[PDB]
Amino acid sequence: KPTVRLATRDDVPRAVRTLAAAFADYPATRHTVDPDRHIERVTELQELFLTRVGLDIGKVWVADDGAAVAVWTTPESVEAGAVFAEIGPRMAELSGSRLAAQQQMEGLLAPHRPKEPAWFLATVGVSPDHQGKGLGSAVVLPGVEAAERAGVPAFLETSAPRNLPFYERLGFTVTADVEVPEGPRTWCMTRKPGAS
Ligand SMILES: CC(C)(COP(=O)(O)OP(=O)(O)OC[C@H]1O[C@@H](n2cnc3c(N)ncnc32)[C@H](O)[C@@H]1OP(=O)(O)O)[C@@H](O)C(=O)NCCC(=O)NCCS
Ligand SMILES: COc1ccc(C[C@H](NC(C)=O)C(=O)N[C@H]2[C@@H](O)[C@H](n3cnc4c(N(C)C)ncnc43)O[C@@H]2CO)cc1
């Protein structure tokens, strides 16, 4: 059984290596991040989300010291807007020549995002070495339990169809099935409190 707890600064190197490996060929990052130094760009994007969103204003869990990691914003993440505005320019630069694809996907998804306070899963990853052993479910469940306790929705977006069963088992339902012209099909998933 995996050991799940809140991340510390000590977990960041391993959590970043986990997130970089997990996202090495993820359809949304392939679509929206420059193919030049792609892994380095994706690695920096994941570290930005881990540190400036997760550890600073959100909630981060790790399984087995960062073999898996889940980053959330919560209803307490009131600075989310300010932080996204601060890191927006860096994320644009990391998009590089795929900026129009980054902007396209943001435009297509923003309207299907929660208009009320939510637990929003910003990024999650399991080390490819440790996949299919329950780390994914274990590192995500605490935020899902916390959303239900607060009586707000949990929300996430995925461009990997093989993820849909994983989130469905945790009680998420597809609330938007978004065709991205010349891009990856993307699902927005909501879990209302008590959905499972
Ligand atoms: C999706 C992910 C978070 C699930 O973590 P996990 O620990 O492998 O999942 P668990 O072991 O808890 O449960 C396995 C289930 O996850 C899904 N899954 C998705 N990709 C998988 C993979 N590479 N290996 C195993 N299961 C995978 C399946 O629904 C699987 O059930 P299955 O038995 O029918 O295959 C993880 O595989 C991952 O990080 N993948 C690479 C990057 C990614 O997709 N990030 C998600 C952000 S949208
Ligand atoms: C940094 O680049 C990434 C990182 C991860 C992913 C996969 C990740 N899906 C999973 C299941 O892991 C994913 O698609 N992440 C997207 C948004 O869903 C997410 N996001 C958008 N708005 C918010 C938000 N608020 C509005 C408060 N709070 C938290 N996360 C948010 O940030 C990332 C960039 O938009 C895709 C791209």
Residue numbers in the entry: 5 to 200
Please quote the authors directly.
Puromycin and the Streptomyces alboniger-derived puromycin N-acetyltransferase (PAC) enzyme form a commonly used system for selecting stably transfected cultured cells. The crystal structure of PAC has been solved using X-ray crystallography, revealing it to be a member of the GCN5-related N-acetyltransferase (GNAT) family of acetyltransferases. PAC adopts a fold consistent with the GCN5-related N-acetyltransferase (GNAT) family, consisting of a seven-stranded β-sheet interspersed with four α-helices. PAC displays the typical structural hallmarks of this family which includes a cleft in the middle of the sheet between the parallel strands 4 and 5 that facilitates AcCoA binding.
The poor initial electron density around the adenine moiety of the CoA made its unambiguous placement difficult and the adenine moiety has been modelled in both orientations. In the two crystal structures obtained in this work, with either AcCoA bound, or the trapped reaction products (CoA and acetylated-puromycin) in the other, the absence of puromycin causes little change to the global structure of PAC. The entry point of the acetyl acceptor substrate puromycin is proximal to the AcCoA-binding region, and this is also where most structural differences can be observed relative to other GNAT enzymes. The most distinctive feature is the insertion of an α-helical hairpin between β-strands 3 and 4; this forms the entry point for puromycin into the active site. The electrostatic potential of the lining of the active site is polarised: it has a predominantly negative potential for the puromycin-binding site and the opposed positive potential for the AcCoA-binding site. Rather, it is likely PAC facilitates the direct acetyl group transfer through the geometric placement of the puromycin amino group to carry out a nucleophilic attack on the acetyl group of the donor. A candidate for this could be E161, but its direct engagement in puromycin binding would make it difficult to dissect which of these roles would be affected by mutation.
